[PDB]
Amino acid sequence: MDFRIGQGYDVHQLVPGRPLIIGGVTIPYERGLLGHSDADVLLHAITDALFGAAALGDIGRHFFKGADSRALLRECASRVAQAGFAIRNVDSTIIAQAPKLAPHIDAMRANIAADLDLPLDRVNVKAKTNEKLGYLGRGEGIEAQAAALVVRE
Amino acid sequence: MDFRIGQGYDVHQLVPGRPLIIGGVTIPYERGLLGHSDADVLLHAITDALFGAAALGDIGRHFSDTDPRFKGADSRALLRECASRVAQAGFAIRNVDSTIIAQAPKLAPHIDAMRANIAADLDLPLDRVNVKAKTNEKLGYLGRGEGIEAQAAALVVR
Amino acid sequence: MDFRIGQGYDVHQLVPGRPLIIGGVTIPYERGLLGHSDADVLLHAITDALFGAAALGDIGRHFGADSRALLRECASRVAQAGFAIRNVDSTIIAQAPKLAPHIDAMRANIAADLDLPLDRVNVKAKTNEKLGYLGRGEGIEAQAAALVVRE
Ligand SMILES: Nc1ccn([C@@H]2O[C@H](CO)[C@@H](O)[C@H]2O)c(=O)n1
Ligand SMILES: Nc1ccn([C@@H]2O[C@H](CO)[C@@H](O)[C@H]2O)c(=O)n1
Ligand SMILES: Nc1ccn([C@@H]2O[C@H](CO)[C@@H](O)[C@H]2O)c(=O)n1
Ligand SMILES: Oc1ccc(-n2ccnc2)cc1
Ligand SMILES: [Cl-]
Ligand SMILES: [K+]
Ligand SMILES: [Zn+2]
């Protein structure tokens, strides 16, 4: 029936004396992500993908003072539903030279799935290095990409 | 039903002495995007996403720069011809989403007009077209304001 | 019915001493992609989009094999999870060499490996307008999107 797709992008700088929080998971590391919120690059990209699929604009059009990125993802889900859409699936990729994200991925999926009220099998998170190329390759920031499918019920 | 997705990417350098044209909107700015056409990075990304969804190749296959008419070509006219070819191949467009990444200028006040242009060229209602804007958080050539990037996604149905 | 989308990304450094293999096609060139196996940046991105659509994690969690064998095993896993592939679209970003003449060859390799009609597979090419490590010819990037349906 009335399916729509959305895509999302984010990047934040890695800076000293900040926690690294990705997909709502705190990952031990000497740097963390810089942003007005908690700088959760993965959650921001997915949020942008969901708004894009519902044609609701973007994260900066909607947004909460001191709200963490999970609260913002939950509010995104609310606004998507308000517009008449159900979320069908989310897929994503984190690009980080370091640290190793592998043992944290299923926790990020579980977080996203709880926040969006989706079963686990409709949420995916992937990881890639940047083969030491560019600012990502030098560990100067972390990027996330996201894709979402929604349907107007 | 026979749904298909497409994705697109574009980037152009930002240089003095060119109009800044994104999503068909001329934006007051002291630099513009460099290309053989009007260099409309957002429209090119969306055009690639539509050709891609329809499995019709890419924008360079359809609109060759070896043609003089490509010089300063209106990227909305290219987008409309793309949509016509996608329709001719048997596909209806269901939605478009996109992202522009630019350090500057401020895009927010032009976004709704970009969306209106795309919706007009694709013969869609506004509510099936979306345009998002991002900085690159000061990282890389984008953070240095050397170019502007666009990303796009499209869903069509045969 | 029960459609799902996936997206994929990959990048490899481009250097002398290795052949250039993209979309299973060997392309004549002074340099080639550095990676564990054949460094096939396009097949890797597409494999990731397929696993992503099926919510099966990623290429590194699943896997001498060449990237086409990996793509085939990926399709089989996607199939076993209950999904049929509807279509694939992709973009290679390479400042050089010229990729247009090899596009049908890549599409044909990908289509064969996924058991898809040729008209459900698309590959596009872009330069990076001389910006960044891609624009300087230091690497090649690929991006992929896949649509599947749970049958
Ligand atoms: N060059 C740019 C980049 C971003 N933006 C707007 O700022 C908010 C934060 O990304 C987003 O809402 C975005 O639309 C902008 O107006 N111009
Ligand atoms: N490495 C590349 C890059 C680009 N191209 C083709 O040239 C057009 C404009 O860059 C693109 O749209 C594409 O058709 C190519 O054949 N190989
Ligand atoms: N910073 C990173 C980057 C990637 N990965 C994991 O490594 C494997 C190959 O990319 C993939 O399986 C991916 O999930 C990781 O654990 N941490
Ligand atoms: O024939 C061409 C050449 C370049 C094109 N392009 C480069 C960047 N954006 C569009 C498109 C079509
Ligand atoms: Cl920036
Ligand atoms: K990028
Ligand atoms: Zn962010």
Ligand SMILES: [Zn+2]
């Ligand atoms: Zn362009």
Ligand SMILES: [Zn+2]
């Ligand atoms: Zn790879």
